[PDB]
């Protein structure tokens, strides 16, 4: 994707006016610096490869991290899947209105020893299970449940010390593109909820320890990384100025356009 | 002369005398839905002379201390003729628009407007926990107007109408990425836009989704000497283009 | 039992790799594509659209619409300065927040020419001539019209067409420049001066305004993607 190169120019005295235009037509001027001054003929070998939509988005970014404690009440995690809880992936996906991609989903699982009381703990390696419940399925309510059979829900098992687990998910949607913005309601009476919380129905993600609690409590943590592949993007949009406030909606507190300087002529 | 145009749609005609060029969409013209993209099976209703004509909204006054206005676009024409009556008896529908803003003055007045048409403009509430209600987001062909101050958090359910953030949290200067046009009272007199149907689904319900928002923001304010005419109005006319509907049921 | 031998770099998670991975939903049928208007293929198409730049940062104008208007009046002396700012499109707070400066803050290197458009939002009976200059670094800031006419300038006559494009050229020793503020790769200054006055008739307001635009040419390019310093987070959004 090589960029355009400059051509040679000569002094002119004519009625052809490249500089004078009209910005009121909503049209950006296509002038080049060989039209207003004398340039020499260079040839550009610069490319526009690293500015593409594939190279700008296909990078892993953390979206959540949740902690579950082994051998204590409520030793399992859950997460209603969305991409609007972090600052740096929300600002990248919200430069476009409609997106259509695949995924490449990598988890990073750690552990830490809790302050036990008995002497001489000696634990084996730990095994974790990450079950994905689609919208409508039966959900677990404790650690030793029937819902972790995974006869139809997909799930991964992982033993500590190895490479991190990684799957790949196609374009799972009802429409023809994901929608980052939605100006509408849920009900037809135009009460109730408003915004992008209406369209988000993607499931739930549960995590637990497979191993039973031997002698000491253990608190683990799993971080979740998204990576869009095969991206198509439509209708660009100006980037967000203010800071984000909530998850479900686009509420904000106003801010100035830029930081200020002392004068209009100061450098 | 490239300064005159003439638009004709149905039994209505718009002539203009000094104007800029016309801006068409993202490069595409409004057409009908094709057969390899449709998802409903029953036959659509295309009346196409009764609903594709110029509907004129109400007029707003451009004051000196005026901040802006906005209209939600498939909602302002919900009580306009046979376009508002087809929207009630049907469940689905798709539409492209043509928009003609017109604001005339003399050679002794000065000012500037930005006429921009933004898709999926979600507005943010003043209180940082709730969402704005329906009456504050849009009125039936009446302009809801911005402010130059900040609406405080004690207002329970209102819209944040600080004009330099354009209600959506972005910088108002960067709004020239959407298809837009300026009205400079030095040279221009009217701004014309053509918008196709932009949505992630081929047909959508028109009563719980406003897929377009028209914003008019004065960047350089209106100014005149003493003696010139102080009342300067702005008038917006919208005409649907290539509309069709599915799913006929009772009135609602 | 084919004998293999594993190299360093095994079982690592490098966040910019290009591998294959087993699918979680086999034989899944995606919804077919649609012809949606306005498909963007490259981020250098967003940076080619002009956006209004807030030149008038004066400590009480940033939270208003008066940051975008450059004040222009009818003087009594000659050769005054209208505005002036250095040319740093990713570090100087004038060009920092515009649509060009928000794409440059995801990348580290940049190279190419930069357009600058000026619309005269005055009356229809007002005239005037301006001098739009650009000076490469090495000297100071030009302090006179005599010192700024020795650079790359253009004289703009207002009239029927109310716009003029000053295209700064690519004058640098290196092929690329740094987005951050650097003394080694400075880029110069952009100034504006009255050529003649603004002459207005009777019953016309003498205080006009000027808007300024900024975009990129067709030789613009960026490199070495990084993370933007403008967004921030302390706790999770809920």
């Amino acid at each position: 994707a090589r960029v355009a190169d400059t051509i040679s120019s000569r002094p002119t005295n004519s009625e052809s006016i490249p500089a004078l235009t009209a910005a009121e037509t909503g049209h950006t001027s296509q002038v080049v610096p060989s039209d207003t001054m004398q340039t020499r003929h260079v040839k550009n070998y610069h490319s526009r490869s690293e500015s593409s939509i594939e190279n700008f988005l296909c990078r892993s970014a953390c979206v959540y991290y949740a902690t579950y404690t082994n051998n204590s009440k409520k030793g399992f995690a859950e997460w209603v899947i969305n991409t609007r809880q972090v600052a740096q992936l929300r600002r990248k996906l919200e430069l476009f209105t409609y997106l259509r991609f695949d995924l490449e989903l990598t988890f990073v699982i750690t552990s830490a020893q809790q302050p036990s009381t008995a002497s001489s703990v000696d634990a084996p390696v730990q095994t974790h299970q990450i079950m994905y419940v689609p919208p409508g399925g039966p959900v677990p309510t404790k650690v030793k449940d029937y819902a972790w059979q995974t006869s139809t829900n997909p799930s991964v098992f992982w033993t500590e010390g190895n490479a991190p687990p990684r799957m790949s998910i196609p374009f799972i949607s009802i429409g023809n593109a994901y929608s980052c913005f939605y100006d509408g309601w849920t009900q037809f009476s135009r009460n109730g909820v408003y915004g992008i919380n209406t369209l988000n129905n993607m499931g739930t993600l549960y995590m637990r320890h497979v191993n039973e609690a031997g002698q000491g409590p253990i608190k683990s943590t799993v971080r979740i990384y998204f990576k869009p592949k095969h991206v198509k993007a439509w209708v660009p949009r100006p980037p967000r100025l203010c800071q984000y406030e909530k998850q479900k909606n686009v509420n904000f507190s106003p801010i100035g356009v830029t930081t200020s300087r002392t004068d209009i002529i100061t450098t | 002369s490239d300064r005159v145009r003439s638009i004709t749609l149905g039994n209505s005609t718009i002539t203009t005398q000094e104007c800029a060029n016309v801006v068409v969409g993202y490069g595409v013209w409004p057409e009908y839905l094709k057969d390899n993209e449709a998802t409903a099976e029953d036959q659509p209703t295309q009346p196409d002379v009764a609903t594709c004509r110029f509907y004129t909204l109400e007029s707003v006054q451009w004051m000196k201390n005026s901040a802006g206005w906005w209209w939600k676009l498939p909602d302002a024409l919900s009580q306009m003729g046979l376009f508002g009556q087809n929207m009630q008896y049907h469940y689905l529908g798709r539409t492209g628009y043509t928009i003609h803003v017109q604001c005339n003055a003399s050679k002794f007045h000065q000012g500037c407007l930005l006429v921009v048409c933004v898709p999926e403009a979600e507005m943010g509430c003043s209180n940082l926990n709730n969402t704005p209600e329906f009456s504050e987001l849009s009125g039936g062909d009446s302009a809801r107007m911005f402010t130059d101050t900040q609406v405080g958090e004690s207002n329970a359910k209102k819209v944040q109408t600080a004009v330099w953030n354009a209600g959506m949290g972005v910088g108002v200067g960067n709004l020239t990425i959407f298809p837009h046009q300026w009205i400079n009272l030095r040279t221009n007199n009217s701004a014309t836009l053509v918008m196709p149907y932009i949505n992630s689904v081929p047909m959508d319900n028109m009563f719980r989704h406003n897929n377009l928002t028209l914003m008019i923001i004065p960047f350089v304010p209106l100014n005149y000497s003493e003696g010139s005419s102080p009342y300067v109005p702005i008038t917006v006319t919208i005409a649907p283009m290539c509309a069709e509907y599915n799913g006929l049921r009772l009135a609602s | 039992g084919l004998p293999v031998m594993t190299t360093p770099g095994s079982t690592q998670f490098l966040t910019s790799d290009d591998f294959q991975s087993p699918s979680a939903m086999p034989q899944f049928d995606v919804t077919p594509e649609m012809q949606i208007p306005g498909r963007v293929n490259n981020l250098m198409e967003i940076a080619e659209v002009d956006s209004v730049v807030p030149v008038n940062n004066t400590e009480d104008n940033v939270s208003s619409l008066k940051a975008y208007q450059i004040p222009v009046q009818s003087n009594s002396d000659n050769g005054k300065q209208v505005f002036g700012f250095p040319l740093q499109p990713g570090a100087n707070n004038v060009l920092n927040r515009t649509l060009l400066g928000e794409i440059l803050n995801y990348y580290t290197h940049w190279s190419g020419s930069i357009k600058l458009t000026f619309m005269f939002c005055g009356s229809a009976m007002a005239t005037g001539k301006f001098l739009l200059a650009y000076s490469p670094p090495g000297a100071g800031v030009p302090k006179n019209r005599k010192d700024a006419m020795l650079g790359t300038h253009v004289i703009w006559d207002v009239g029927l067409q109310s716009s003029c494009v000053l295209c700064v050229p690519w004058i640098s020793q290196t092929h690329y420049r740094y987005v951050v503020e650097d003394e080694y790769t400075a880029a110069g200054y952009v100034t504006c001066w009255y050529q003649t006055n603004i002459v207005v008739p009777a019953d016309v307001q003498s205080s006009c305004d000027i808007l300024c635009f900024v975009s990129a040419c067709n030789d613009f390019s960026v490199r070495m993607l990084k993370d933007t310093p403008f967004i921030r987070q302390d706790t999770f959004y809920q």
Partner: antibody, heavy 117, light 106 residues
Framework: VQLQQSAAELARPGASVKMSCKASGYTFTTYTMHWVKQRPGQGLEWIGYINPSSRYTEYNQKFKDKTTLTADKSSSTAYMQLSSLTFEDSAVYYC???????????WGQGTLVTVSA | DIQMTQSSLSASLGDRVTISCRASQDISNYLNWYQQKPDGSVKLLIYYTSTLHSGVPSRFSGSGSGTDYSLTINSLEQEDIATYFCQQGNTFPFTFGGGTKLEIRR
């Protein structure tokens, strides 16, 4: 990043005291700065905030006519002035920087204000 | 205006401590717990019903839904003798709860 308050002050009943909360470690014109008051025999009580970018202040409905908040973008400082002082304004005043939705992640160390003769 | 009801709870070293505060109406899981040291330094502990702030030890945990909420310390140490408030974020203006100070048993 840390907020550093002024020292403890002392004034007559009916007088006026002006406090300070000098911020550092972050861009001052981004986040709003709130003020919380704690009487020594009760809990904490909200007063109001100020957007430093636009100088918009919004007070609590009980403190609307006594307090007044102000800021300056150069020296990275937020002030608060009390007026028509009674004996019920003897407390400790904290300045807090509001996080994402309703959270106060950073606090000042508090200034003690007392009135007597 | 939501009244946030919270007075002096006593516990010994190394046991399970539970602090509770009750809202006036439904606040929908918008609660924050703060800790005020006896020299006067306040810091955020739990910025949701249960989510811990980054830099808080694992002894603290929160629970509850609707109207009644709770805060639990499972192993009370010496540095946890302070004052704990709860704060709603559902309605303007923000209201804090009354304090609850800890003290050793015997």
């Amino acid at each position: 990043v840390q907020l550093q308050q002024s020292a403890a002050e002392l004034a007559r009943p009916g007088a006026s005291v002006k406090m300070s909360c000098k911020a550092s470690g972050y861009t001052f014109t981004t986040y709003t700065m709130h003020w919380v008051k704690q009487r020594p025999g009760q809990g904490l009580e909200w007063i109001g905030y100020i957007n430093p970018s636009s100088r918009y202040t919004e007070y609590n409905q009980k403190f609307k006519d006594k307090t007044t908040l102000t800021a300056d973008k150069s020296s990275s400082t937020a002030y608060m002035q009390l007026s028509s002082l009674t004996f019920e304004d003897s407390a400790v005043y904290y300045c807090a920087r509001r996080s994402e939705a309703d959270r106060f992640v950073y606090w000042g160390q508090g200034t003690l204000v007392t009135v007597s003769a | 205006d939501i009244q946030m009801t919270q007075s002096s709870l006593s516990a010994s070293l190394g046991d399970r401590v539970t602090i509770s505060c009750r809202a006036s109406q439904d606040i929908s899981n918008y609660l924050n717990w703060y800790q005020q040291k006896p020299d006067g330094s306040v810091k955020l502990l739990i910025y949701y019903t249960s989510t811990l702030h980054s830099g808080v030890p694992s002894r603290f945990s929160g629970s509850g839904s609707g109207t009644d909420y709770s805060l639990t310390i499972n192993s009370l140490e010496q540095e946890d003798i302070a004052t704990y408030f709860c704060q709603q974020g559902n309605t303007f203006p923000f209201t804090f709860g009354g304090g609850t100070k800890l003290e050793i048993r015997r």
